[PDB]
Amino acid sequence: EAAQSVDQLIKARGKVYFGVATDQNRLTTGKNAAIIQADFGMVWPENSMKWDATEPSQGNFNFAGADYLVNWAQQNGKLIGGGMLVWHSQLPSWVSSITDKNTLTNVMKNHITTLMTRYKGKIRAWDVVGEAFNEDGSLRQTVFLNVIGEDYIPIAFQTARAADPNAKLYIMDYNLDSASYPKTQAIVNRVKQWRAAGVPIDGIGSQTHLSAGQGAGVLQALPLLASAGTPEVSILMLDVAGASPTDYVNVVNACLNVQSCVGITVFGVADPDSTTPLLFDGNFNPKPAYNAIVQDLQQ
């Protein structure tokens, strides 16, 4: 099993994990749980730790699905990622209705602290802030930016560090897949600046929702992301329209080529649950791209 497990093989190449996004609905259906046990070393909650799932009315938290995933991971010896803690999407209306800076600051801090404390010491990495950038590299004008101001990112990270200093704290975004695209250099410059200002950004997580042929660009984009000087970078929500072995192998090689890249997470198991962009088909059989990653990693 290990000889065809992308997680075991990537660990044998010196990386920390090959991970997957999942949740109770996947783990109790089809072959998802068996595939994840065999092939993936880290699980991320597809939805169960987002703000809409965990705090749908202020101070009224729901951890049913998040608890399920965390205990499933512990029983199966998997690393655990969490998030997203601060995100403009999947955000309850009670949050976006707040217009007072002190109120939203307190709410955001409590949301971060409550989630992170509940699982303190069990979570390898948290996505603390996601999708904070516009495509031109300016900051996205979300309720957090508008109400708290640019300090919301420093505040979120400082609050997260205090709640669980064991975890690696990530900023994440999409369309960081080309070293030419304005967004990639912009997040690098801003993260460099924030870290110089003492903000505890441990990682940049690149979603990596690719279209066909875009894998080649990740070979250049990921080193550029690593030049921000964060402790870690990662590939966080990988899928590839057309699922070409060439695109998938290029993403894997990009991580292999970057010393600070700790691992890769694919955004689900089987295609119907994702452009047929995943590594397993609707019969839960591995696709050519899965076999190609295995062959690339073997030595």
Residue numbers in the entry: 1 to 274, 279 to 303
What did the paper state?
Here, we investigate the molecular origins of the nearly billionfold rate enhancement achieved by directed evolution of the computationally designed Kemp eliminase HG3 (7). Although the first-generation HG3 design is significantly more efficient than an “off-the-shelf” catalyst like bovine serum albumin, its specific activity was further increased 200-fold over 17 rounds of mutagenesis and screening.
Cryogenic structures of HG3 and HG3.7 in the absence of a ligand revealed that β-strands 6 and 7 (located adjacent to the binding pocket), adopt two distinct backbone conformations whereas only a single conformer is observed for HG3.17. Although conformational selection has been observed in the optimization of other designed enzymes, including Kemp eliminases, what is striking in the HG3 system is that the active conformational sub-state was not explicitly engineered into the xylanase scaffold but only emerged upon introduction of the 11 design mutations due to a serendipitous backbone flip. Instead, design created two “energetically frustrated” enzyme conformations.
